[PDB]
Design an enzyme around this catalytic site. Structure first.
Site, mmCIF file in Angstrom:
data_model
loop_
_atom_site.group_PDB
_atom_site.id
_atom_site.type_symbol
_atom_site.label_atom_id
_atom_site.label_comp_id
_atom_site.label_asym_id
_atom_site.label_seq_id
_atom_site.Cartn_x
_atom_site.Cartn_y
_atom_site.Cartn_z
ATOM 1 N N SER A 51 -12.940 1.678 64.073
ATOM 2 C CA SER A 51 -12.074 2.641 64.749
ATOM 3 C C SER A 51 -11.654 3.770 63.804
ATOM 4 O O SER A 51 -11.160 3.508 62.718
ATOM 5 C CB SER A 51 -10.830 1.952 65.275
ATOM 6 O OG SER A 51 -10.024 2.879 65.965
ATOM 7 N N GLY A 52 -11.854 5.008 64.233
ATOM 8 C CA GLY A 52 -11.422 6.173 63.485
ATOM 9 C C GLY A 52 -12.424 6.644 62.436
ATOM 10 O O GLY A 52 -12.176 7.610 61.747
ATOM 11 N N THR A 57 -17.052 9.351 67.432
ATOM 12 C CA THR A 57 -16.938 10.292 68.535
ATOM 13 C C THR A 57 -17.128 11.781 68.161
ATOM 14 O O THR A 57 -17.670 12.553 68.959
ATOM 15 C CB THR A 57 -15.637 10.054 69.316
ATOM 16 O OG1 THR A 57 -15.791 8.873 70.097
ATOM 17 C CG2 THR A 57 -15.320 11.202 70.260
ATOM 18 N N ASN A 115 -6.144 5.415 65.050
ATOM 19 C CA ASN A 115 -6.841 6.622 65.424
ATOM 20 C C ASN A 115 -5.888 7.256 66.425
ATOM 21 O O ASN A 115 -5.260 6.568 67.248
ATOM 22 C CB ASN A 115 -8.285 6.313 65.815
ATOM 23 C CG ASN A 115 -9.045 7.544 66.275
ATOM 24 O OD1 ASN A 115 -8.564 8.669 66.170
ATOM 25 N ND2 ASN A 115 -10.251 7.328 66.787
ATOM 26 N N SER A 117 -8.412 7.667 69.575
ATOM 27 C CA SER A 117 -9.260 6.494 69.791
ATOM 28 C C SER A 117 -9.922 6.487 71.170
ATOM 29 O O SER A 117 -9.263 6.702 72.179
ATOM 30 C CB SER A 117 -8.459 5.206 69.585
ATOM 31 O OG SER A 117 -9.250 4.067 69.844
ATOM 32 N N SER A 118 -11.237 6.284 71.188
ATOM 33 C CA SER A 118 -11.978 6.040 72.426
ATOM 34 C C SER A 118 -11.629 4.651 72.968
ATOM 35 O O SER A 118 -11.812 3.640 72.297
ATOM 36 C CB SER A 118 -13.490 6.113 72.191
ATOM 37 O OG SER A 118 -13.899 7.395 71.747
ATOM 38 N N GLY A 162 -14.990 1.427 68.409
ATOM 39 C CA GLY A 162 -15.356 0.800 67.157
ATOM 40 C C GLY A 162 -14.542 -0.434 66.820
ATOM 41 O O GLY A 162 -13.489 -0.708 67.396
ATOM 42 N N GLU A 195 -12.048 -3.008 65.671
ATOM 43 C CA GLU A 195 -10.626 -2.834 65.392
ATOM 44 C C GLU A 195 -9.844 -4.130 65.261
ATOM 45 O O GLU A 195 -10.129 -5.127 65.926
ATOM 46 C CB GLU A 195 -9.983 -1.948 66.444
ATOM 47 C CG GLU A 195 -10.150 -2.495 67.821
ATOM 48 C CD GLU A 195 -9.399 -1.682 68.848
ATOM 49 O OE1 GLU A 195 -9.125 -0.496 68.598
ATOM 50 O OE2 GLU A 195 -9.094 -2.222 69.912
HETATM 51 MG MG MG Z 1 -14.205 7.545 69.660
#
Ligand code: MG
Ligand code: H70
Length: 776
Positions: A180-181, A185, A232, A235-236, A456, A458
């Site tokens: 994550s982060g 993306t 993030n 974050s997605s 991602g 996490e």
């Molecule tokens: Mg993302």
């Protein structure tokens, strides 16, 4: 030419900066250096020491202070000659070891060189600041250039995938890994931008809109699908596979987004400091005062769904402003003003639903004393408020075949309300995706380049089912890397019998994968499922079951001694403790049909579609039950992966520099963890020790023509004609290898040694033209 002009932004922003006379003095030094740990406890904190002497099996070196230290040559991490510092492809390093590889990444990073190749794949270290390398000017530079010609860049990896699509007429994929982060993306966006630009249509200039609509599809999803987590700020909260589609000719013909695993729970709950989906804050902060009026909006702090985290804004982000971007993205994509207002009604409606306060009545069942929130929701949704109220607190169920009205308590009513909210949000999101897909896909693709942008890896203080699903996905993506880099690669060498001794790269997260999605014996998801449709089962019988199957039996599983509600999975990226609370309900994902009945009746054209459309509102039936979330997602994922196996994969490994979202702070322990668990060094090692490029004997008559004893594209023998063009320059024999039906080249001979034969300015018209029409 900008790439050769030390003045260019290209050189300024993508190339290692010119060393000075002092650096030259050091670069030609005869001294040798070693990477060591001053503190053997802290194995990821390295210093550079000078080798002062050596025995047959040992180096002795000076520590940063003047102490002398000795080490086995076998256990030594030698420092590469400094001429290598900044090198663009680390497969070139003389010494391939953790501190060496990290050091090279560090040198490039210190001057904002965030891309570095590692053998076949690209590493991307998140800068956490803007760097001017994604302009249309930059695109232009990279258009068509060979990987070795230009500096490392997401555009270059994208161009290569593109060229390979065209040259092989085969579908490709850009798989972008990262926790994550880490940057997944942002790099996804660049891949699309680049593809959009390099393969886009001008054609007199009045039809390129498709490409603008592709570009614009992502700001929409991002506003509904992204949120601030502790890891993030953007974050997605859903994964996505983007198909960029090309025609036979090679131009963009469309695109298609498959979304995965939206984190529905975020809508009703966010942990401290986190945020709900951007869209809620964008709406609230960016609506016209009259929209605020029609929707009965008010501030973030007025809504239970927005006011529990303690955070309503993100440093350096204007929600009012992002809202304009989203609206504009919705215009460009083709969302009619009614469609858009419906969308904000639904968003506003969710917020009100969240403000409904259930209380205990006379009995045990709940009552709704203040109907303010209820009415505002019904108003906005276009549903009957007293019908909704009855559906919330008194849903009807079958009991056998009898119809019985439930009287849910406060706890059950709140939960059901949440379920309605998550269903609303999830269906809306799916609709948005459907709408977009229908706009973008209007041409039977001939080829595609698939771009994978998942949530991602996490870890939080509290990890729930969502995280298990996220980290399982990341676990499978990594195994996909493992599979193509090491397993498939070697299996080939074996087939071709090129005298390859197998290497175990010690990277296989199959056991972990099995532990999660295993059927026989049953893994976590299977037991979850079994338990999900077992009528008396609880979160507690579930964790007990898991414990009983895996505790002290599965090496990847741990029953913690410190908790009765958590179980540990050891993933490639580290052990994650998962809290079992609510897993059954999350997996069943139930919604009272009386709520569905209540909304199927909505007067709103969008809301009605969310509830009446079987492809959005319907659920697959797994025999006597609805398919569980676990089963459904295992099934989507397998399908994705099956699609991926059919593509030619290109890997970008994104790497987070630290855990603070700060620029200019490369934390070695953080980076090295990722470098290890990604198998970055092993990937470089396979590309060095192995034979990446190999062409079939027949087709070997391809770039090779009369650069040796006369032999054009013809020959009657295949294994003979091969050794022919090679021996002319006497190119190293052990630098390639002859296999059953192919000819392998060690670390890319097609480029390494082949620089006089191919890629020449002579050898075509110059060595033929001496006596054209003037021979007497
Ligand atoms: Mg993302
Ligand atoms: O249909 C749903 C229901 Cl009934 C309840 C919940 Cl919690 C979520 C969904 C949902 N979420 C997403 Br994303 C899709 Br597509 C669907 Br369907």
């Amino acid at each position: 030419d900008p790439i050769h002009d030390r003045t260019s932004d290209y050189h300024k922003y993508l190339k290692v900066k010119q060393g000075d006379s002092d650096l030259f003095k050091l670069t030609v030094s005869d001294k040798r250096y070693i990477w060591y740990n001053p503190d053997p406890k802290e194995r990821d904190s390295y210093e550079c020491g000078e080798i002062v002497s050596e025995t047959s099996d040992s180096f002795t070196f000076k520590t940063v202070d003047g102490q002398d230290r000795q080490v086995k040559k076998d256990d030594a991490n030698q420092r590469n000659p400094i001429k290598f510092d900044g090198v663009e492809d680390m497969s070139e390093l003389s010494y391939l070891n953790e501190p060496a590889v990290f050091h090279n990444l560090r040198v490039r990073y210190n001057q904002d060189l965030i891309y570095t190749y590692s053998g076949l794949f690209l590493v991307a270290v998140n800068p956490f600041k803007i760097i001017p390398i994604y302009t249309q000017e930059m695109v232009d530079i990279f258009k068509g250039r060979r990987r070795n010609e230009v500096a490392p860049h997401i555009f270059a990896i994208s161009d290569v995938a593109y060229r390979s699509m065209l040259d092989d007429r085969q579908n490709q994929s850009l798989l972008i890994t990262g926790e994550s982060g880490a940057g997944k993306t942002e790099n996804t966006k660049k891949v699309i931008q680049y593809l959009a630009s390099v393969a886009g249509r001008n054609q007199a200039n009045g039809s390129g809109v498709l490409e603008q609509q592709i570009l614009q599809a992502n700001p929409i999803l991002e506003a509904f699908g992204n949120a601030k987590t502790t890891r993030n700020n953007n974050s997605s909260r859903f994964g996505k596979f983007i198909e960029i589609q090309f025609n036979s000719a090679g131009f963009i013909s469309g695109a298609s987004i498959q979304s995965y695993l939206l984190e529905k729970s975020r809508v009703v709950f966010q942990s401290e400091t986190e945020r709900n989906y951007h869209i809620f804050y964008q709406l609230l902060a960016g609506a016209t005062a009259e929209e605020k009026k029609a929707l009965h909006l008010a501030g973030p702090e007025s809504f239970n769904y927005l006011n529990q985290s303690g955070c309503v804004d993100i440093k350096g982000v204007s929600d009012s402003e992002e809202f304009k971007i989203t609206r504009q993205a919705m215009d460009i994509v083709g969302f009619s003003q009614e469609e858009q207002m419906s969308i904000f009604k639904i968003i506003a409606g969710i917020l009100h639903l969240g403000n409904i306060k259930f209380e205990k009545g006379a009995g045990e069942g709940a009552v709704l004393k203040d109907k303010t929130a209820l009415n505002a929701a019904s108003t906005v949704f276009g549903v009957n408020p007293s019908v909704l109220e009855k559906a919330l607190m008194e849903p009807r169920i079958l009991a056998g075949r009898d119809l019985v009205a439930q009287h849910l308590n406060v706890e059950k009513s709140s939960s059901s309300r949440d379920a309605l909210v998550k269903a609303l949000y999830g269906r809306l999101f799916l609709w948005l995706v459907i709408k977009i897909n229908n706009v973008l896909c209007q041409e039977r693709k001939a080829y595609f380049i698939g771009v994978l942008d998942i949530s991602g890896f996490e870890i939080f203080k509290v990890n729930s089912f969502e995280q298990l699903c996220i980290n399982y996905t990341n676990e499978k993506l990594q195994q996909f890397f493992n599979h193509h880099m090491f397993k498939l690669e070697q299996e080939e060498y074996l087939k071709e019998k090129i005298n390859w001794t197998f290497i175990d790269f010690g990277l296989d997260s199959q056991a972990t994968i099995d532990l999660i999605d295993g059927r026989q014996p049953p893994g976590i998801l299977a037991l979850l499922d079994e338990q999900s449709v077992f009528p008396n089962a609880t979160d507690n019988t579930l964790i007990t079951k898991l414990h009983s199957h895996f505790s002290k039996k599965n090496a990847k599983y741990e029953e913690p001694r410190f908790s009765k509600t958590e179980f540990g999975v050891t993933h490639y990226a580290g052990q994650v403790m998962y809290e079992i609370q609510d897993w059954l309900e999350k997996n069943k994902d139930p919604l009272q049909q009386d709520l569905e009945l209540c909304f199927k009746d909505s007067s709103d054209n969008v809301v009605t579609k969310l509830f009446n459309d079987p492809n959005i509102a319907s659920r697959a039936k797994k025999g006597a039950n609805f398919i569980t979330v676990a089963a459904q997602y295992k099934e989507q994922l397998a399908s994705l992966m099956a699609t991926l196996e059919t593509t030619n994969p290109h890997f970008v490994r994104c790497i987070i520099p630290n855990n603070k979202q700060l620029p200019a702070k490369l934390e070695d322990k953080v980076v090295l963890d990722q470098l290890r668990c990604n198998g970055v060094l092993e990937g470089i090692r396979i590309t060095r020790k192995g034979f990446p490029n190999r062409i079939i004997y027949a087709d070997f008559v391809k770039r090779y023509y009369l650069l040796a004893p006369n032999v054009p594209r013809d020959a009657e023998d295949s294994q003979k004609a091969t050794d022919a063009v090679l021996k002319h320059l006497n190119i190293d024999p052990e630098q390639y290898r002859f296999g059953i039906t192919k000819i392998f080249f060690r670390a890319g001979q097609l480029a390494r040694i082949e620089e006089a034969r191919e890629q020449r300015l002579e050898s075509n018209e110059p060595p033929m033209d001496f006596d054209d029409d003037i021979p007497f």
